[PDB]
Design an enzyme around this catalytic site. Structure first.
Site, mmCIF file in Angstrom:
data_model
loop_
_atom_site.group_PDB
_atom_site.id
_atom_site.type_symbol
_atom_site.label_atom_id
_atom_site.label_comp_id
_atom_site.label_asym_id
_atom_site.label_seq_id
_atom_site.Cartn_x
_atom_site.Cartn_y
_atom_site.Cartn_z
ATOM 1 N N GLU A 189 0.773 -1.236 0.000
ATOM 2 C CA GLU A 189 0.000 0.000 0.000
ATOM 3 C C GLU A 189 0.810 1.295 0.000
ATOM 4 O O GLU A 189 0.486 2.244 0.719
ATOM 5 C CB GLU A 189 -0.971 -0.015 1.184
ATOM 6 C CG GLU A 189 -1.797 -1.298 1.243
ATOM 7 C CD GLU A 189 -2.824 -1.301 2.354
ATOM 8 O OE1 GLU A 189 -2.481 -0.914 3.490
ATOM 9 O OE2 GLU A 189 -3.978 -1.704 2.095
HETATM 10 C C1 LIG Z 1 -0.343 -5.647 3.962
HETATM 11 C C2 LIG Z 1 -1.022 -4.399 4.506
HETATM 12 O O1 LIG Z 1 -0.411 -3.331 4.535
HETATM 13 N N1 LIG Z 1 -2.275 -4.529 4.934
HETATM 14 C C3 LIG Z 1 -3.113 -3.356 5.105
HETATM 15 C C4 LIG Z 1 -3.100 -2.915 6.573
HETATM 16 O O2 LIG Z 1 -2.496 -1.634 6.684
HETATM 17 C C5 LIG Z 1 -4.508 -2.875 7.174
HETATM 18 O O3 LIG Z 1 -4.420 -2.669 8.575
HETATM 19 C C6 LIG Z 1 -5.276 -4.175 6.892
HETATM 20 C C7 LIG Z 1 -6.751 -4.070 7.232
HETATM 21 O O4 LIG Z 1 -7.368 -5.351 7.232
HETATM 22 O O5 LIG Z 1 -5.178 -4.603 5.501
HETATM 23 C C8 LIG Z 1 -4.534 -3.664 4.621
HETATM 24 O O6 LIG Z 1 -5.295 -2.504 4.570
#
Ligand SMILES: CC(=O)N[C@@H]1[C@@H](O)[C@H](O)[C@@H](CO)O[C@H]1O
Ligand SMILES: [Cl-]
Ligand SMILES: [Cl-]
Ligand SMILES: [Cl-]
Length: 499
Positions: free
Chosen positions: A307
């Protein structure tokens, strides 16, 4: 007789399902005079003491640990086809014997033993028992070497004791790695001497505002030590170049416009980014990784990489090309979220796949290709093992962006044939991440972690031949009285026939 069954639970009724279970004969019964016999070594006594500590409260027995005599419970290190983590457990009137090549195997055997014993074993005061252990033999070895659980201590901070508590929760299911998400937009949780404000300022709050927190190097060292005693290799993560607001807010110079953004207390993602075009950025990353590596006895260092939506594609690639080498510079193996597969993973790197069934073929292909090129794969699908995801539209905590994830969906899949086109031998294992945007206390962590946590552990440990929802749900339903007695809140899914 839920709390204290008249007869012992079946020898095969444990999670993860053991590789081989051969029930037979009469059970063993722990009585007041039972001794725990171990080999005359530090590591042997260590597992012996661990077991004694788990049993003394509920039994009210002395359970001395010694390197002499023929104890009713014996932990022995010997040759055998059990590898670094496997073991053999024999039970009968003559006693219980757990044999393994290494301490980790004995430890895993202990995790099986605590499930063979009745739910009353979880109590803190003396119970009548009976302390029965089904008779027979269990020979167990793991399918995958990477069986991890991640705890997000950035969205909401959890102190050393709360982390130790979570460590004990996962240790029950033979996980062998603990992924700690030490930094994100809402907080920086590890003190870095070269950049003091990261912790004092960047760690000053969390989601929802108010006090945050962070680990001093001493505290982090204690978490690593405690995890090691539970045979969990700590895999620390410093997310970059995205999910970096805590750091950016602490040092104005790290920002592209030279202005420090405010501390973030919201729950959105993808808006932050280190400034790829500035030299200071790489001095910063080198300083942090160098200090973190020094505190990490484990083999891996997770640099995240997911992200980074405020980082242009070309910049992300350039950034990863520059930072990956820094990990090897400090003697560690790089791990990153699967977005790294699109930025030329260095040799020996592993990528953590958090995609979903609905993910586009192009994205899946990029990861499968990395697998073909030698990159190790850690599987943690957002619509399968993200423990923060709601069970249904009515779940009071968690998120729903990945759809809903009931108990069966979380368990009902095979890591070996999950990602289309990916070589089965490239799959290193699985991970169950627990994000904390919506969780602020230990009990809430339990409610979202259980009952799906044991399932992911099984996927990492058990033979594919033992995988079956209809029979697994019976073994999962059996955990109910144990969790109740242990004070572990869990979601009573209607898909599971709770005992
Ligand atoms: C791999 C990664 O960065 N995952 C992100 C994390 O920031 C967030 O807390 C989560 C929510 O379920 O899933 C994604 O948005
Ligand atoms: Cl526990
Ligand atoms: Cl926001
Ligand atoms: Cl968002």
């Amino acid at each position: 007789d839920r709390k204290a069954p008249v007869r012992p639970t079946p020898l095969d009724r444990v999670i993860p399902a053991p590789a081989s279970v051969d029930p037979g004969g009469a059970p063993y019964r722990i009585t007041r005079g039972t001794h725990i016999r171990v080999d005359d070594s530090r590591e042997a006594r260590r597992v012996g003491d661990y077991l004694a500590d788990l049993l003394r409260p509920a039994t009210g027995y002395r359970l001395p640990v010694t390197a002499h005599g023929h104890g009713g419970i014996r932990l022995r290190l010997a040759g055998g086809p059990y590898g670094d983590e496997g073991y053999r457990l024999d039970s009968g009137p003559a006693g219980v014997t757990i044999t393994a090549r290494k301490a980790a195997g004995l430890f895993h055997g202990v995790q099986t033993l605590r499930q063979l014993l009745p739910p009353a074993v979880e109590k803190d005061s003396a119970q009548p028992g009976p302390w029965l252990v089904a008779g027979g033999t269990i020979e167990d070895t793991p399918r995958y070497a990477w069986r991890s659980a991640m705890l997000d201590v950035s969205r909401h901070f959890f102190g050393v004791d709360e982390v130790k508590r979570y460590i004990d929760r996962v240790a029950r299911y033979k996980y062998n790695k603990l992924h700690l998400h030490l930094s994100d937009d809402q907080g920086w949780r590890i003190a870095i001497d070269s950049w003091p404000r990261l912790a004092t300022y960047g760690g000053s709050t969390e989601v929802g505002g108010g006090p945050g927190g962070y680990y001093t190097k001493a505290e982090y060292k204690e978490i690593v030590r405690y995890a090691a005693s539970r045979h969990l290799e700590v895999v620390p993560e410093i997310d970059m170049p995205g999910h970096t607001n805590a750091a950016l807010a602490s040092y104005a110079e790290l920002n592209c416009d030279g202005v420090a953004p405010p501390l973030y207390t919201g729950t959105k993602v993808g808006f932050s980014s280190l400034c790829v075009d500035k030299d200071v950025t790489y001095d910063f990353v080198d300083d942090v990784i160098g200090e973190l590596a020094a505190l990490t006895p484990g083999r891996y260092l997770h640099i995240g990489g997911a992200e980074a939506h405020s980082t242009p594609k070309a910049d992300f690639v350039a950034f990863m090309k520059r930072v990956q080498p820094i990990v090897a510079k400090y003697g560690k193996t790089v791990v990153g979220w699967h977005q790294l597969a699109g930025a030329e993973p260095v040799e020996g790197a592993l990528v953590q796949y958090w995609g979903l069934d609905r993910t586009g073929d192009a994205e899946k292909a990029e990861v499968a290709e990395a697998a073909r090129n030698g990159t190790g794969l850690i599987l943690s699908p957002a619509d399968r093992t993200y423990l923060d995801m709601k069970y249904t539209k009515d779940t009071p905590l968690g998120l729903s962006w990945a759809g809903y994830v009931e108990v069966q969906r979380s368990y009902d899949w095979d890591p070996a044939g999950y990602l289309p086109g990916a070589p089965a031998d490239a799959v290193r294992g699985v991970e169950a991440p627990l994000w904390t945007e919506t969780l602020s206390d230990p009990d809430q962590l339990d409610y979202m972690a259980f009952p799906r946590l044991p399932g992911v552990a099984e996927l990492g440990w058990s033979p594919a031949s033992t995988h079956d929802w209809d029979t697994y749900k019976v073994r999962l339903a059996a955990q109910a009285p144990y969790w109740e007695a242990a004070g572990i809140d869990f979601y009573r899914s209607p898909q599971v026939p709770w005992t």
